Amino acid sequence: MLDRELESSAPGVPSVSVHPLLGSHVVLPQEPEEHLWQGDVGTEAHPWLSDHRVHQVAVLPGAAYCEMALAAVTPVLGDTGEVHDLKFHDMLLLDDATPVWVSAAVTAPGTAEFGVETHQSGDRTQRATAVLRGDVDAERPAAHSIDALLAAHPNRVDGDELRAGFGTVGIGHGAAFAGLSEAYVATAAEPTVVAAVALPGPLRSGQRGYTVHPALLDACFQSVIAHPEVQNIASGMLLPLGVRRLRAYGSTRNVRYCLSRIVKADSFGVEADLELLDADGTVLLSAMGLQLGTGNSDKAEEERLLDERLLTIEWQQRELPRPGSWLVILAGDDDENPRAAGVVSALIGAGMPTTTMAWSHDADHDAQAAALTARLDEQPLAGVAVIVGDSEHDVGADARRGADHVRHLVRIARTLADAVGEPPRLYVVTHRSQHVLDTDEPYLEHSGLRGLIRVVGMEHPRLRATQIDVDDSTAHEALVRQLLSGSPEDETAWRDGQWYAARLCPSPLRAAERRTAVADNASEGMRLVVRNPGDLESMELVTFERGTPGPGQIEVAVKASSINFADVLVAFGRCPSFDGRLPELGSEFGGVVTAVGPGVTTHRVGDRVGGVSANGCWSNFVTCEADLATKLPEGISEHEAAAVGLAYGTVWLGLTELARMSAGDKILIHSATGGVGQAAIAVARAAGAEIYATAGSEKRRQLLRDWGIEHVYDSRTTAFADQIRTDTDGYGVDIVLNSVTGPAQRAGLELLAFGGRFVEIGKRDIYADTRLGLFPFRRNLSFYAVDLALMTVTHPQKIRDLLATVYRLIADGTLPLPEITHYPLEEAATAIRIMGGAQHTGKLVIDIPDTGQSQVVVPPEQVPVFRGDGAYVITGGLGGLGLFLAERMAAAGCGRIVVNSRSAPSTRSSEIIELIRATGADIVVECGDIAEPDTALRLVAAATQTGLPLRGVLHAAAVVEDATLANITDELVEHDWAPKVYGAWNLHQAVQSGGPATSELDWFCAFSSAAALVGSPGQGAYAAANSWLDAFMQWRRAQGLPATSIAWGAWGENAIAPDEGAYAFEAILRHDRVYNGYAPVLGASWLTAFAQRSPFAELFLA
Amino acid sequence: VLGDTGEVHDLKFHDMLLLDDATPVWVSAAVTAPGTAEFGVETHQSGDRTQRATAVLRGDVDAERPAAHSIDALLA
Ligand SMILES: NC(=O)c1ccc[n+]([C@@H]2O[C@H](COP(=O)([O-])OP(=O)(O)OC[C@H]3O[C@@H](n4cnc5c(N)ncnc54)[C@H](OP(=O)(O)O)[C@@H]3O)[C@@H](O)[C@H]2O)c1
């Protein structure tokens, strides 16, 4: 509109052009040339950013920081430049609004430090850092022949096919990030990829002021994965971690191709060099040294894999929802079932024509099978309820009976499957078959049937194989309610009047699923720590092995320790440290020497001492250096010294030592109601200084006024400054014990006059690199930084003397001790909530229990598991997993490993045992059929023989005979059942039967199968044997004995690897969880098929 | 700063800013206490920072709109 422009040539709105990401730019008024941008990278501001998402959560791609760095070059360094050593730190998770701060600072001419950070509730989080360089030479790589390149790379890779592959590992690329059309490759020998990238149509409008659009640059990074050497080697989650050198030669608007080159292709990561070419082949941008990789740590990769692979069955309290003839059939005729009687009466009571069948063991099964098939063809029925009979506490009997039930349910299930018409719904009613409520002790016999009904439902889904695990107390009126409601639930249970329903889920927790113990407080190590800072509920009492001290160290028996404000920040994760590592809870202590390490003349055992250590002083025993402890004088207790130490030390150092607090001079004590505050008052009163104090609460301020201190102000504002200037007739103060921050720090410096002694104890502003204006220093001011924590490492003698001098002054009575409020170790979190909320006054002391009392404690991975002072037994050790585990255990440090297998050792097995015995650890081989009882005893006696107590068992012994329900013979059931169930019981008995050597074991593990859990068709007999063995472990745990079961997946020698399972096995044992299911889950065919068929795997579909 | 109606308190000017074709100035307001903020204008040239103006800002003050006058009566 030529008119609109001429009339608008007068009222113009004041606006300025900005970068889409970087946003508003400000150059700070300081040397060196320091720049600063503030901008939004939220999904509301930049919709297209929602299309890049890791694990279904929108995150900022690596490519975004690349653009930000490239963009920040020209304004800082007014020239053509590069971006060197660009690194991506934490993963930025995007919201509707995600403000981000970029900042570049000139270090040297033609060089500048770059950095993208994000600020949340005061806490800064660095997201990326690099170096900008302008001095670099204009070395534009020569244009390429797009025709020749594409001719040299004939093998085409589709973009959608590759982006689908990214979705499996967890990385999602939406419409915006689908720029990669297709990538052309050749072989692994050829290290290059010619990719056909292009910024999608919607984003072409939004090319705006981008050096390179991050959507486009990420599509180039995707192109690197199309290389065959990358696909073959690094078959894991590859995320960009950084870029060695980034330069833009021109506009990337017309980029149509991306030429990649593999520098290095390793299992850990992939390095590559990129070049963005236009249609002609001219280079527009180059990325040398693009580093991709498995996000963080090698050990953190294992921990993450283990979590995804684990599986557990969980029971949910459910209600029967919404809105034909029936047949009730039995499994024991000589046993009169009131459940069967009551069910038939309740179905007829509901108004359904019910018939009853009496199939029992030791009966003509071919004739009864024909009688059943006749009843089905005679009348069309809706469902068939199979009532399993319960005989009449002996497990031995229930293990033998459990086989007969499986053999009999196969006979019944086979005849229902072989139906001319539409098969009716099968309902199997078992008596306390499996564990649902934590209080339950499982009734076996029916334990094996849950694996069979799961396989029958998979082999023959027409008849929806449903299981109903009933208890004695429940009522038949509520049971038939389930049969007639027709809910699609396949695994169900009844405990009292409540209906439960199973559901498969991964649960790799480490809270209740971690070992527990009880430990003495006089003996045995126990320490207090936060498993994850921020949450005070995560404050745990952990165990530690208190070892011999030395050289030049001392073990102290702590009677008490303090709670400093520093220990609160540690609890919330807000504590700053020069080391970088977050310190341990408890800095100071007061105790009695336990042991003196070789060799120190200074300390003696039984000396009452107080000191410092780190390493957690909220524990019964602390090992501290001789440099950090001092004998307490007679005038003070362990608890008095534990409170005083740091508060008075910091003050002593700060006021009387650094600031040389003279008499009469005015002192400003910030937050004077606290520990350091009360200590400051004490020495200020002693020195004869005029006190000016501050405090947050009115109640807290009024306390200072009552303590006899005139001149009290608010610590949360900058009022105190002008108020003190008025209350001193413009003089101000002399000394300032600054615990406060920000403008209150600056205001405090501006306050003190001539004498000027600013003592900063507060670390926040130092670690934040706050540019402190030097102009107030024109009056001979003196700034003092104080970090006793650091001093304890750099000059421990000065800290020794500083503690020793305050313990002397306080014991002499030269200084009076402050308000001390004791807290038992248990209520430590409560003291933190109080201190952390500014509710407290004075000092808070943690009292350590000097008693013969016991306290419940948690061993994380201090668990023994594999040890040289203990023997081990492995059934099925001469082959399969057992031989790999035995070899791994011998290497892990095990004294005597008895290996068993009914067959003699093979030629390759004997060779493996020879090299293990050659490399120290002895391996005994005692053959036998574990199904026979004498074998279990012979094994146990052999493992103990070398003066070693049995510390663990492994039940890998197994037979696998697979057959379809139609051809599952009665003999084949006993073949698979015998080693798994009879061996497990004979092992259990051999352990109890054994003397005190066997009554000391740490674990009892049993290798189960994932086929029992899901229902792999054809297994059946093997599946049922495992479901009994899985329930047997929950029963063994219920009795108190240790017990474990690991339902394994598919091993190698997509499928579990050998060394992958070794870590999982060892890990599962470090934790107190009975059922563990290690199996490759990802997005497998058998899981996607199982999730859509039944609501048991509801959480897997999502 | 204070997303509301506000007063500017104790506005002081110090050194006389002489202007050139370019004279960059940095304004800077920080919250100190609630509904209150230290305001400050300054200029950095050759390494010497020069505070050209300062004040406090208040958003907690009450809108006591002075009464309107009679333009014509006033002129009489
Ligand atoms: N080596 C060292 O550098 C060193 C040694 C010791 C202590 N210090 C520093 O000195 C300070 C006091 O130590 P202390 O334990 O002896 O005294 P303290 O009074 O026990 O420490 C806590 C006080 O900090 C104030 N505070 C401000 N913001 C707070 C928040 N978000 N949460 C909780 N409290 C808050 C509260 O006082 P008001 O409400 O009265 O303002 C509270 O009483 C700490 O800030 C600590 O880092 C430094």
CSV table of N, CA, C and O in Angstrom, one decimal, chain A residues 26-31 716-718 743 746-747, chain B residues 26 30-34 38 42 44 46-47 49:
chain,number,residue,atom,x,y,z
A,26,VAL,N,21.9,-7.8,24.2
A,26,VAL,CA,22.5,-6.7,25.0
A,26,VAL,C,24.0,-7.0,25.3
A,26,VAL,O,24.3,-8.1,25.7
A,27,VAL,N,24.8,-5.9,25.0
A,27,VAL,CA,26.2,-6.0,25.3
A,27,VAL,C,26.4,-5.3,26.6
A,27,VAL,O,26.0,-4.2,26.8
A,28,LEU,N,27.0,-6.0,27.6
A,28,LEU,CA,27.1,-5.5,28.9
A,28,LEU,C,28.1,-4.4,29.1
A,28,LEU,O,29.2,-4.4,28.4
A,29,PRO,N,27.9,-3.5,30.0
A,29,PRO,CA,28.8,-2.3,30.2
A,29,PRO,C,30.0,-2.8,31.1
A,29,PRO,O,30.0,-2.4,32.3
A,30,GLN,N,30.9,-3.5,30.5
A,30,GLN,CA,32.1,-4.0,31.2
A,30,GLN,C,33.1,-4.5,30.2
A,30,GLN,O,32.8,-4.9,29.1
A,31,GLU,N,34.4,-4.6,30.7
A,31,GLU,CA,35.5,-5.2,30.0
A,31,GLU,C,35.7,-6.6,30.5
A,31,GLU,O,35.7,-6.8,31.7
A,716,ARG,N,15.7,-9.6,54.4
A,716,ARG,CA,15.2,-9.9,53.1
A,716,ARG,C,15.1,-8.7,52.2
A,716,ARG,O,14.7,-8.9,51.0
A,717,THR,N,15.4,-7.5,52.6
A,717,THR,CA,15.3,-6.3,51.8
A,717,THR,C,16.6,-5.5,51.9
A,717,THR,O,17.5,-5.9,52.7
A,718,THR,N,16.8,-4.4,51.1
A,718,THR,CA,17.9,-3.5,51.1
A,718,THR,C,17.6,-2.3,51.9
A,718,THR,O,18.2,-1.2,51.7
A,743,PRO,N,21.6,-7.7,45.5
A,743,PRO,CA,21.7,-6.3,45.8
A,743,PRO,C,21.9,-6.0,47.3
A,743,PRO,O,22.4,-4.9,47.6
A,746,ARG,N,25.8,-5.9,47.6
A,746,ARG,CA,26.2,-4.6,47.1
A,746,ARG,C,25.8,-3.5,48.1
A,746,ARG,O,26.6,-2.6,48.3
A,747,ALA,N,24.6,-3.5,48.6
A,747,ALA,CA,24.1,-2.5,49.6
A,747,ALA,C,24.9,-2.5,50.9
A,747,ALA,O,25.0,-1.5,51.5
B,26,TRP,N,23.0,2.5,29.5
B,26,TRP,CA,22.4,1.3,30.1
B,26,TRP,C,21.6,1.6,31.2
B,26,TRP,O,22.1,2.1,32.2
B,30,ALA,N,16.5,-3.2,39.4
B,30,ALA,CA,16.5,-4.4,40.1
B,30,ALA,C,15.5,-4.3,41.3
B,30,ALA,O,15.5,-3.3,42.0
B,31,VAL,N,14.8,-5.4,41.5
B,31,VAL,CA,13.9,-5.5,42.6
B,31,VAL,C,14.7,-5.7,43.8
B,31,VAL,O,15.7,-6.3,43.8
B,32,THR,N,14.3,-5.0,44.9
B,32,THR,CA,15.0,-5.1,46.1
B,32,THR,C,14.1,-5.6,47.2
B,32,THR,O,14.4,-6.6,47.9
B,33,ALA,N,12.9,-5.0,47.3
B,33,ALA,CA,11.9,-5.3,48.2
B,33,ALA,C,10.6,-5.4,47.4
B,33,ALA,O,10.6,-4.9,46.3
B,34,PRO,N,9.5,-6.0,47.9
B,34,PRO,CA,8.3,-6.2,47.1
B,34,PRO,C,7.6,-4.8,46.8
B,34,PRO,O,7.5,-3.9,47.6
B,38,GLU,N,15.3,-0.7,42.8
B,38,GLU,CA,16.4,0.3,42.5
B,38,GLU,C,16.5,0.5,41.1
B,38,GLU,O,16.8,-0.5,40.4
B,42,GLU,N,23.3,4.6,33.5
B,42,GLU,CA,24.8,4.8,33.5
B,42,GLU,C,25.4,4.7,32.1
B,42,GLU,O,24.7,4.2,31.2
B,44,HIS,N,29.3,3.9,30.1
B,44,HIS,CA,30.6,3.3,30.1
B,44,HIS,C,31.2,3.7,28.7
B,44,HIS,O,30.7,3.5,27.6
B,46,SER,N,35.5,4.2,27.4
B,46,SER,CA,36.9,4.2,27.7
B,46,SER,C,37.2,3.4,29.0
B,46,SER,O,38.3,3.5,29.6
B,47,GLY,N,36.3,2.6,29.5
B,47,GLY,CA,36.4,1.9,30.8
B,47,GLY,C,35.9,2.5,32.0
B,47,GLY,O,35.7,1.9,33.0
B,49,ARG,N,32.9,3.9,34.0
B,49,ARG,CA,31.4,3.8,34.2
B,49,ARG,C,31.0,5.2,34.8
B,49,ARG,O,31.8,5.7,35.6
